[PDB]
Each structure stands twice: as structure tokens, then as C-alpha cells.
Amino acid sequence: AKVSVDNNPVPTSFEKWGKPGHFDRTLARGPKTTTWIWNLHANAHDFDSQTSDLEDVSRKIFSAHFGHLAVVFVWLSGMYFHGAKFSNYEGWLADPTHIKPSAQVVWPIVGQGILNGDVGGGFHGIQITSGLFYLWRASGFTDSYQLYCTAIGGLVMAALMLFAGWFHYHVKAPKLEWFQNVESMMNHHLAGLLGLGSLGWAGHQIHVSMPINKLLDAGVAPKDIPLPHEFILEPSKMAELYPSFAQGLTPFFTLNWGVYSDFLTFKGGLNPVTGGLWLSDTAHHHLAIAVLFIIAGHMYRTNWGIGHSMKEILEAHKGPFTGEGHKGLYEILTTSWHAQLAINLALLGSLTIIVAQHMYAMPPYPYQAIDYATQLSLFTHHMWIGGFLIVGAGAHGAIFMVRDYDPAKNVNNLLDRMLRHRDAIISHLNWVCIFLGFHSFGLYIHNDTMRALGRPQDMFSDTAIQLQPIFAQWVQHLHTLAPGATAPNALATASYAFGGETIAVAGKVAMMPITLGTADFMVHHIHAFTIHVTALILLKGVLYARSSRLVPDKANLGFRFPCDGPGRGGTCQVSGWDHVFLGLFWMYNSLSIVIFHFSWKMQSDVWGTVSPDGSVTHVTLGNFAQSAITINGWLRDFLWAQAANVINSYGSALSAYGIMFLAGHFVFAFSLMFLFSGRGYWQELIESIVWAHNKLNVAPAIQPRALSIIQGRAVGVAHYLLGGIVTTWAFFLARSLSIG
């Protein structure tokens, strides 16, 4: 066993609760100005700066992660309880195509009971767009008692997580050697968490979800369907639904796997009844990835000499152009938490971006594709989460570079070589950013000017100069031919976005081919430009955090400092924190353009109503192709046109959205107080106001101070992003709930 712990390192007492700022030496002394408050709420969860012992920092990180797990468990239990008690899930289950989901009920106090709109079936409540009902239907939920039991279990798990944090910090704290068993951690977390989780979910689906969903799709009422344990207790029903279940587990151990083909298929595509993925396809999928992850385990040497070593692999992959190669990286990623945070944040953010872009093309949940509001909400939500996580990676990497980077251990290794040609990287990246922005946004402005001048034949359109995405069309053609040709055992395409027939449920298009033209070319290259610019900002922050030709000692100044001074012409916003602050806005811009493109293209070319004849009428008709090529088209046919549903929301059940819409437009503007101004003006104003309060002998002991420069920038960016995102959220929700 590699376990090593320390018993009762920190006593459990309430005294330090009464002394805020205890962690910091500069704050535990007592407040003299108001800044002491803002520091207290800012340096709290920065354990690295509080103490120099790495083991204590790791222990604190472990227990804090336990706390976040407990909070998430409480959130999940609350979701299940509010879906079990204040929701029409049981009503929606019987009539899923005629009842809107709803799980929030509003007390009537000051007229907000108007928010309790008619969601169908005689139920009054706020319509939900999270898609929890479809997930619950796919999971096999049929009664509210099961949801209530799930909520109770979630609360119990949250309490257990809290106790685990208390135990593993205040009682039995792990040792540093325990935390650095990266091989053992990786093995247990690839095989024991991802592989075992996938195996358990595949077992749940096969033994619970598929029978219930098969009976539900046939037309059986929810109350008639047998409870999930009855399938296990009496396998006769399971054999009736799936004949191969009569064979038992014998073919599995004799490799006669083909007999299981009926409930482990490779169909691909969408289920016609529900519009979601086939549950047999998902079963074989999660089973396959479970097997793959368990096999990916058993790879790193832990205790029996049988396995690879991460350090050997890293130090063995070196070449001519890279000097020492991947040498010293193992010590970097086993001694600094910030580098691990940066890598994990970047990969996780990209992962949620992938989730957002893949969950809409192949909708996995029943009746989710036809609920356009849920589709748009899920896409945009996980898109924003991914963007924020990527920016956080860009931030905490610079934090690592400022603090945990040591030149002694990095000689001619990849990190040093990166630090050597950083000027070339930044210059070439800046050039590519300028080129992308120029040519793309100039196509846009050129189209605007040509349209305004009455020369539509000189534009960049499908009728005019084409600019067709030939490569994307070619890959779409290849993926459309894949079933039978390059994936012979597949029945249909991975998704109908590439091509194929139009899958439509309840007279509403679930998925139809998404054609790419001139507008798609322009928007995709605009996306590339914005992403490369955000990457440029964050990369300049990371690479130049240590020093630069302007300031050669920024590392000693710290990671979060406002400036070096008015000298050298002016040295404002030179810290890495300032680079993060600047990159947040560009992430917002890029993600806003991405979600706008998604929404408009989805409304104009896919979503809509299908007639009995077969004709498809789209939400905004085919106006994306001929309008999204000019900025005026984006302003008139997207913002002005589709904002009608949010500006005319007053007096109805959607009024809240309208209110929130205006709320966003306020906070954004409010943020311009802090971004456009500085703190000396506010300090002088506070001096005058302090004189006023002093004349009446009501001056406070804690001397008021204007916010710091860094705090001012942070407040500005926070309120700005909040206002913009809330505006977009209200607009999207109103539009998507008002388009049927």
C-alpha cells in the first residue's frame, strides 16, 4: 500500500470563525481602510500564497474539491426534488408532444403569478429549458416517487461529501507522496472512474432504460409499464422484449457476441418515434468505451513493476529541433498545481465546446430535437462554460509561469525553447490575426458597401462571387456515403447534418441536412479570426508574464499588479492578470458570434414545420443565405427582427424575460463606469464626502477608499460580462419559447 496520512493535524474549533482574515498575515491584523474587506474576499481561496508548504496546499485543495462536490450534489438533489414536487413530469410523460415541460412554480405575491403560464395539461408554471425531462425519460423515470428518492439520495451524498472533506482534512490528512502518485491516480481514474462508470451506465441502460423506453415508444401508458426491478426479478419480460436475453450470459463468455445483436446495434441516426438516438446504439457505445477505458488503465507502473513510467516516456521523446525535448516536464506537473490546473482547464473547456457542438447534431435525448428552446439553451450554456474554462486555463498558466517556473530545472528543454522564440511566435500570430481580420471582416464591409451602392453583382454571395467551402462540402459528401462504403456495418449516418433524409417528429423538423454556402464560409473564417485573436492575447499573457523588453522584471512585481508606472511612455496593463482581463472580452465576442451564427442558421435552414406532403417551412425562412453576408443583414434580419418576441413580452407569461432583457442592457452600461475611469477621481470625491460625514461627526472608523485599479478593472469586466450574457440569455429564451 502507498497510503500515507497524518492524524489530527488541525483541531476542529470555532474560534477562527470569529476572526475573519486569519489566513492572511496582512489581513489578520485588523482593518484600517475599506480595502481590507475587498482583500479578504479575494485572497481567501488562494492557498498557494497563504503558506509555503506544498503538502498543506494539497490538503486544502483536496478538501475544497470535496466541498465543491458537496455543493454540486446539493444542486442535483434540489433539481430532482423540484422536478418531483413542483413539476408536471408525470403529466408530460403521458403526452410529451402536447405538454410543455415545467418545474418552477411562482408564488402570487405582487402579481408575479402571471409568470405561471399555461404549459398545457392544466398545469401552471414556469417552462424549463434545461431538458431535464428528456434526460429523465431516457433514464427510465416514470413516477415522481423515484425522483423524490433520487433527491433524497443526492442530499445524503452531499452530506457524505461534506463529512469526507472534514475527515480527510481535519482528521486524517494525506501526505505529499500520496498526492504525487500520478501513475496510481491515473490508473484508478481511467479504469475505476471512467471505465467503471461507463460499464455501470451501460448495465443500467441495458437492464433498465431500454425495456422501459421500448414500451413507452410502442404506446403503452406510463402506469402500465412494469417497474424497473420487475424486469430483473422476472426475466421473461426481458426475453419477450429482446429474444437474445433468453440465451443468458453464456454467449458473452464464449465470444458468441453476435447473438446480442438485437439489443446491441450499430444503427446510427435518430429514432423516428422520439427524435433521439437509439438506446441500443448508446448501450454498445458506452460498453465499448468502458472496455476501452479499462484497457487504457493497467498502463502505468504502480506497485508490481508491470507498466509504463510517465517520466521515461517524457524524457524519451526528444528530437533534433527541440534540444532536451520533453525533459523536466514531469517535475513541473508533479510539483505545481497551477500547471495542472491550466492543462485541465484548457482540455475541459474544449471538451464542453465539443459537447455543445456534438449534442445538437446527434440529439441523444428523446423529444429534445423538436424542443428548439432546449436545444438552443443547452448549446449556448455549455458553449459559454467552455469559453470561460479556456480563459481560466490561459490565466492559471500565466500564474504558474510567474510563480512556479524555475529556470534552474528548465535548461534547453521545450519550455526554455518556447521562452526563446516567443517574439517570433507572437509576431507571426499577430500577423495571422491581422490577415484573418482584414480579409474576412473586409469581405463583410465590402459586401455592405456594394449593397449600399446598388451593385449587388459585385458582392461576395452565392449569386455573386461565390467563395464556396469546397473542403467542408467534400467532407460532408464523404460522411454521407460512409454507411455501407467505409463503415459497412453501420445502417445510417452519424448525423443528418452531413446529409440524408429529413427526420421530423410531431410535424416538427428534428434534423435535416445543413448546407454550407458563402455565408457559412464567411462565418467560419470569422470564427477562426476571433479564436486566433483570443489565443494571441492569452498566449502573450502566458509567454511574456516573466519579463519583456519594456519591463524586464515583471516576475518580481507579481502576477496581479496594475502597472509599472507612467514612465517608459506609460506601462498600463502589463501584468498577466491584465492579459486575462483583456482576453475575457474577446472570448465574449467570439462566443457571442458563435451562438448568434448557431441560432440564426438553426432557425433559417433546419428548424421549422413539416407538412403532411413533406414540404419544410423554416422558422425564419431561407433568409440566412442572402442576409448574413452584410452587417446590415445581421442587424436587421437577426437582432431587430427576432427581438420582437422579447420586446413585446410585457403583460404575458414571458414578461420576466423582457424585464431581464432590459436588466442586461442596464448592467453592461453600468460597467462602463469602471472601465472608462480611474480611481483618483473617485478618491477625491470620497474625500469630499468624508468631509461631509465628518462635519456631522458620523465619520466611519474604517476609512473608505476608492477601489484599487485591479479591483476596478475586475468589477468592470464582471458587470460587463454579466449584463451582456443576461441580455443574450433573455433574448434567446424569449425567441425560442415564442417560435413554437
Binding site: 482593518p31 484600517k32 482583500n39 484599487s708 485591479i710
Partner: protein, 69 residues
Amino acid sequence: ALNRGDKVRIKRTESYWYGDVGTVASVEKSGILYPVIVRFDRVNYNGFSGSASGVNTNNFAENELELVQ
């Protein structure tokens, strides 16, 4: 004249405590041209951007202080 424990009002006209009251922490008896040391309950703006405290002590000449006590 000004001794320990003397509550005095500041008349430097540019210090942070002009018109405020402080107490005489020490007086140095030599040719020093700002010999009086005065400490204050309030702290000034001294410190880098983000610092949680200032300075609560300063040196003054005898002529720019008015005894109150």
C-alpha cells in the same frame, strides 16, 4: 514645549492630517529641522495600489502644530 502624550492639531497644509488631531510620540532634541514625531489613529494613502493600510506616523516641525490636549 510639546511633550509626550500631547494632543496637537496639524497645520502643515499639505499633510494628510491637516486639521486632524494626533499625539506626540516623541521629540528629538538636536539641530533636526523636523524634530517632532506625531502619530495618528487614521492612516494616509501611502502604499502600493491594493495595500490594506497606510502610515500612521510622521515628522513635523514645532511651528506647524497647535497644542490642544
